[PDB]
Amino acid sequence: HMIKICIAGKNNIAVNSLQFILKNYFEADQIVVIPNKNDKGIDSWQKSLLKFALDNNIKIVTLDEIYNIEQIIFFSLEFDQIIKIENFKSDRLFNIHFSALPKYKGVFTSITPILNNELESGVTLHRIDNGIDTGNIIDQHCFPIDINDTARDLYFNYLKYGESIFKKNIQTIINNSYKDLKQTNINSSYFSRKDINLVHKINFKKTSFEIHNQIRAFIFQEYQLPIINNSKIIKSILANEFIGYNVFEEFENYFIISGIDGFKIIAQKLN
Amino acid sequence: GHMIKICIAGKNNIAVNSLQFILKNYFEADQIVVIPNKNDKGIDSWQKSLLKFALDNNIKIVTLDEIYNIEQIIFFSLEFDQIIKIENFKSDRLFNIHFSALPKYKGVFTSITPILNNELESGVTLHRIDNGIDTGNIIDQHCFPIDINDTARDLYFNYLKYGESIFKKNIQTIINNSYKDLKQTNINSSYFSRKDINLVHKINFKKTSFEIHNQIRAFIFQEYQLPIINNSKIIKSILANEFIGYNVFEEFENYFIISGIDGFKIIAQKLNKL
Ligand SMILES: Cc1cn([C@H]2C[C@H](O)[C@@H](COP(=O)(O)OP(=O)(O)O[C@H]3O[C@H](CO)[C@@H](O)[C@H](O)[C@H]3O)O2)c(=O)[nH]c1=O
Ligand SMILES: Cc1cn([C@H]2C[C@H](O)[C@@H](COP(=O)(O)OP(=O)(O)O[C@H]3O[C@H](CO)[C@@H](O)[C@H](O)[C@H]3O)O2)c(=O)[nH]c1=O
Ligand SMILES: Nc1nc2c(c(=O)[nH]1)N[C@H](CN(C=O)c1ccc(C(=O)N[C@@H](CCC(=O)O)C(=O)O)cc1)CN2
Ligand SMILES: Nc1nc2c(c(=O)[nH]1)N[C@H](CN(C=O)c1ccc(C(=O)N[C@@H](CCC(=O)O)C(=O)O)cc1)CN2
């Protein structure tokens, strides 16, 4: 068919990966795009896929419009819809998921690995099957969650590494010469929206590492910041200085906190 | 200096067998004292009673107050139920075996917490006691697997086993005071209190098969409780690699068949099964 590829989703990973295909592989007339339902068609703190496509004379389609395109490559890059694979003639359906699968299937993956005490995360390119982030893994890139990284910092890492893993593998996908491996049952985890209360209530009867992690997992200013006694927190810093157990002291610009193991946290208040 | 050399404080097979080992190999009975836990009524049940062993072997029962002034005494907590304040003691030879791979899973119910948090292994850790909970310097650790179908009960019996073993491995160097240790790191340190665990766990099925399995088996410890699914007590959970479709739930006379979001088969065996 004339149309070779659909890019579906949002943000700079989608925009940049589309730019890369336009520059290196396919002409506009060979590409269609499905923006997310919330795409305003203007750039914000991320670029708009809708705007990029219109600016570049790529057609905006719906899923209904591509299901019958033989051999189309369908590529989800932060797409907001669950696919049903039997809708499609093509079986060339792919996603980049922002975690180190099989762990942290589902949502809010800039939050969940932090909240669960992980030292690393990853991006994973996989085939789409009918389950949520369950299909066979094509490629994965693991990277650290540094000790004072926030959810926002981690999200910007997913965008960066996600764009790179796209570029690394896209020719094998286009050539249908990639290899994949089924995901294991062990280590598989999943979160849905119901599992995370974005207005997090910190549990201080925890270690310093855990309290620190509770704070920084919710630091993502475009959405929210965690609040301690009515002040928003912009950064948490965990040190291995021992300051005594269960410290909590509020100052004008920051809190000094330690948990049951007495390591020092500085929780910096938003200016 | 003093006649008393060692105090064993705590409960269950670990305390009893450790005490038996020192009495056989290291100290006579008049050199040893014991502090049972508050709920020890001196009756052997599914674990042995430390109080009963002491009574049966003429090893004196004491309180912490009676040992604080014993210089050089070796104090060992083997599932002890009291928090120590090290400044009460003249001796600095104060030790604990905690049932986890520290620094993870400080605090309570460590037969439940690693399972519920999706771990594949656990451990026992011999440490110095400081004024924090399970925070003192590590002397030795032995890690072991949590087998995929282990229950909390199964994991508790492995702690008893490996815990008794790590005591024997280290006791000579404690007695000769030549042991080495290392400060715990801040990174990976985790802690649970009784408030963080609801022993009447309501299963979240909007999870992976692995996670649903873990949620069930983490609460299987029949002396205390069993998890309940559709008003049936569950005695065992078995997780397989077989794909059966997403979000399966079917009740049979003797078991449930369950899968989560990733569609792996779980068999949850009912207690009523003959
Ligand atoms: C909405 C929201 C998001 N965030 C943070 C954590 C999220 O990981 C990150 C990105 O948010 P979203 O893109 O809305 O949602 P997230 O669950 O990460 O993304 C999933 O759901 C998105 C919306 O359905 C899909 O477009 C993505 O493909 C899918 O991966 O921003 C917050 O901290 N607070 C928020 O309220
Ligand atoms: C009381 C209770 C226990 N358990 C299981 C899981 C526990 O890890 C295991 C042992 O129970 P306990 O010895 O009462 O509690 P546990 O938190 O494991 O032990 C801590 O607390 C004990 C009581 O303070 C201390 O004596 C120990 O040194 C300490 O390690 O039994 C249950 O599954 N349900 C229960 O209701
Ligand atoms: N079938 C399928 N569709 C896929 C992917 C997948 O692996 N498989 N990857 C992406 C997965 N995805 C985003 O990357 C995506 C988008 C929307 C929702 C969604 O509708 N979420 C609800 C859950 C609804 C439900 O319970 O089924 C939520 O958590 O509240 C979920 C995931 C895009 N579509
Ligand atoms: N200071 C300290 N004491 C220790 C250990 C330790 O690492 N540090 N290890 C063990 C930790 N432990 C179990 O392994 C354990 C037991 C009870 C409580 C506790 O908090 N107990 C009582 C107060 C005790 C009393 O003074 O009578 C309570 O809260 O009711 C805390 C930890 C035994 N004691």
Side-chain angles (χ1 to χ4, degrees):
Chain A
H1 187 289
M2 204 192 293
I3 297 163
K4 295 296 212 194
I5 188 163
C6 172
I7 301 303
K10 73 167 168 177
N11 285 174
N12 294 347
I13 182 167
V15 169
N16 296 351
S17 284
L18 170 57
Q19 182 175 234
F20 186 77
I21 262 86
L22 193 65
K23 187 190 95 230
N24 290 293
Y25 289 108
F26 298 124
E27 295 292 288
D29 279 356
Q30 302 177 286
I31 309 166
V32 298
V33 159
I34 307 171
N36 292 358
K37 283 173 233 91
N38 66 351
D39 185 334
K40 295 155 171 170
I42 62 149
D43 299 335
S44 194
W45 55 280
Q46 287 287 293
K47 296 185 285 190
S48 169
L49 184 68
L50 171 55
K51 183 190 184 281
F52 182 94
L54 299 162
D55 286 354
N56 282 279
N57 300 126
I58 297 171
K59 189 177 198 221
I60 301 307
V61 306
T62 66
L63 278 167
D64 290 334
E65 289 170 332
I66 67 167
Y67 291 150
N68 297 322
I69 303 180
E70 275 183 26
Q71 293 289 112
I72 201 181
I73 297 161
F74 175 79
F75 227 118
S76 159
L77 296 174
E78 297 307 285
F79 188 45
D80 59 354
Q81 301 188 63
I82 298 167
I83 291 310
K84 298 170 194 176
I85 66 178
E86 292 85 354
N87 280 324
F88 278 87
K89 302 201 192 140
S90 183
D91 66 350
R92 305 168 75 177
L93 315 174
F94 308 95
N95 182 242
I96 290 169
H97 183 69
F98 289 175
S99 81
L101 289 171
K103 293 188 152 185
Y104 309 109
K105 303 176 173 65
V107 307
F108 294 152
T109 60
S110 299
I111 304 182
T112 57
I114 302 185
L115 192 53
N116 287 277
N117 310 315
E118 303 284 357
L119 299 185
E120 45 180 70
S121 197
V123 296
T124 303
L125 172 61
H126 60 96
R127 302 190 62 171
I128 296 173
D129 74 10
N130 282 330
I132 292 166
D133 303 324
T134 47
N136 288 19
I137 294 171
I138 304 163
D139 197 16
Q140 179 171 99
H141 180 74
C142 288
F143 62 84
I145 304 174
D146 284 342
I147 193 47
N148 298 324
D149 282 348
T150 64
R152 187 171 185 285
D153 293 329
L154 176 47
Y155 189 71
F156 280 79
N157 283 334
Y158 284 148
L159 289 168
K160 172 165 76 205
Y161 291 118
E163 171 180 349
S164 294
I165 204 166
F166 177 93
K167 286 174 191 178
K168 177 171 179 291
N169 287 275
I170 186 55
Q171 184 168 17
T172 61
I173 296 280
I174 292 166
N175 285 348
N176 208 55
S177 57
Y178 66 88
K179 302 172 95 297
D180 62 48
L181 292 153
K182 66 204 233 287
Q183 290 191 50
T184 59
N185 62 340
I186 61 161
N187 303 306
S188 186
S189 55
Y190 173 92
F191 297 81
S192 73
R193 280 146 209 167
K194 315 87 224 312
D195 297 328
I196 300 294
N197 186 348
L198 291 166
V199 182
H200 186 62
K201 180 177 161 49
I202 293 164
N203 177 1
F204 287 83
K205 192 168 163 152
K206 294 296 217 167
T207 68
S208 294
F209 176 70
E210 290 170 298
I211 288 166
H212 171 75
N213 290 347
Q214 291 175 76
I215 305 169
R216 74 207 175 103
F218 295 91
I219 292 173
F220 202 148
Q221 189 171 5
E222 291 79 5
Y223 301 98
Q224 76 295 297
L225 300 171
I227 289 164
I228 299 175
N229 295 346
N230 307 313
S231 292
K232 293 170 170 183
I233 305 300
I234 191 58
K235 183 73 169 178
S236 198
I237 311 279
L238 180 67
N240 45 230
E241 178 180 350
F242 183 79
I243 68 157
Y245 311 112
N246 309 306
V247 174
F248 186 100
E249 185 159 12
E250 175 167 9
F251 290 89
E252 189 184 343
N253 288 325
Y254 57 82
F255 296 82
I256 301 292
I257 302 163
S258 70
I260 71 87
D261 59 352
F263 298 108
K264 181 191 194 179
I265 311 165
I266 311 165
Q268 307 190 316
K269 294 171 169 179
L270 186 65
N271 310 350
Chain B
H2 201 286
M3 163 95 141
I4 306 306
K5 300 285 189 219
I6 184 163
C7 171
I8 296 297
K11 70 171 172 181
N12 286 1
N13 293 1
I14 190 170
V16 174
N17 292 351
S18 292
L19 172 54
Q20 177 170 40
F21 183 85
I22 49 179
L23 185 65
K24 205 183 263 218
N25 297 280
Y26 285 105
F27 295 112
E28 301 203 86
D30 65 354
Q31 304 180 285
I32 298 169
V33 296
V34 307
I35 310 177
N37 281 18
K38 201 175 176 299
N39 70 337
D40 191 342
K41 318 147 301 131
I43 286 139
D44 293 333
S45 59
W46 58 281
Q47 286 293 296
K48 292 162 187 174
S49 171
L50 184 65
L51 174 55
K52 164 193 215 274
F53 185 93
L55 292 173
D56 291 3
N57 292 281
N58 191 41
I59 298 159
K60 187 159 55 152
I61 305 317
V62 300
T63 56
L64 286 169
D65 283 337
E66 300 181 85
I67 66 168
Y68 289 152
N69 297 132
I70 303 184
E71 285 148 61
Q72 276 327 78
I73 200 183
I74 294 149
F75 171 84
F76 251 105
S77 152
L78 300 176
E79 294 308 284
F80 192 49
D81 63 351
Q82 303 191 57
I83 190 130
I84 297 306
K85 295 172 188 67
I86 62 171
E87 292 86 358
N88 276 323
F89 279 88
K90 288 197 176 160
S91 177
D92 66 355
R93 300 179 84 182
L94 321 173
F95 309 96
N96 180 235
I97 292 167
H98 179 66
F99 283 182
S100 80
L102 291 167
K104 298 185 144 179
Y105 306 107
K106 297 173 172 69
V108 305
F109 287 164
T110 59
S111 297
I112 306 188
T113 60
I115 302 180
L116 190 64
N117 290 275
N118 309 309
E119 300 287 352
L120 304 181
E121 67 186 292
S122 198
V124 292
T125 304
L126 173 60
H127 64 97
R128 297 190 69 171
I129 290 182
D130 69 27
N131 281 342
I133 300 173
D134 303 326
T135 43
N137 300 11
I138 298 174
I139 303 170
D140 195 18
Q141 175 173 95
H142 176 74
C143 300
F144 58 88
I146 296 171
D147 278 352
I148 194 58
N149 301 321
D150 284 348
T151 65
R153 186 188 199 273
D154 287 339
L155 178 49
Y156 188 70
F157 280 83
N158 281 327
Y159 288 140
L160 299 166
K161 173 168 65 163
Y162 291 110
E164 172 181 341
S165 175
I166 210 173
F167 175 91
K168 290 171 182 178
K169 177 177 178 290
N170 284 278
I171 185 57
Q172 181 64 86
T173 63
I174 286 188
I175 289 173
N176 74 18
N177 204 59
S178 53
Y179 74 83
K180 297 193 66 78
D181 66 49
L182 192 68
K183 291 179 108 280
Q184 287 191 52
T185 322
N186 58 341
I187 300 311
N188 301 304
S189 187
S190 57
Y191 169 90
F192 296 80
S193 69
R194 266 186 200 217
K195 192 97 163 200
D196 303 325
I197 297 305
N198 186 347
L199 294 165
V200 191
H201 186 66
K202 173 152 159 56
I203 297 155
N204 179 356
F205 292 83
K206 197 153 154 37
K207 288 294 211 170
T208 70
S209 293
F210 184 58
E211 286 170 310
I212 293 170
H213 172 76
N214 293 343
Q215 290 176 72
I216 294 167
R217 69 201 177 109
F219 291 98
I220 298 168
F221 203 143
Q222 186 173 7
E223 295 80 3
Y224 299 105
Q225 80 290 300
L226 295 175
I228 287 154
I229 300 182
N230 273 15
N231 294 293
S232 300
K233 297 184 174 186
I234 305 294
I235 189 53
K236 185 73 176 177
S237 185
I238 306 156
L239 178 67
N241 259 119
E242 183 187 340
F243 182 85
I244 69 155
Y246 311 109
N247 308 301
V248 175
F249 185 96
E250 294 298 326
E251 180 171 3
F252 295 90
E253 288 195 47
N254 290 324
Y255 50 82
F256 301 81
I257 305 290
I258 307 173
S259 65
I261 70 90
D262 55 356
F264 303 104
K265 183 184 193 184
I266 302 165
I267 301 165
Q269 179 175 330
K270 292 188 187 169
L271 182 60
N272 60 252
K273 189 175 199 281
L274 288 186

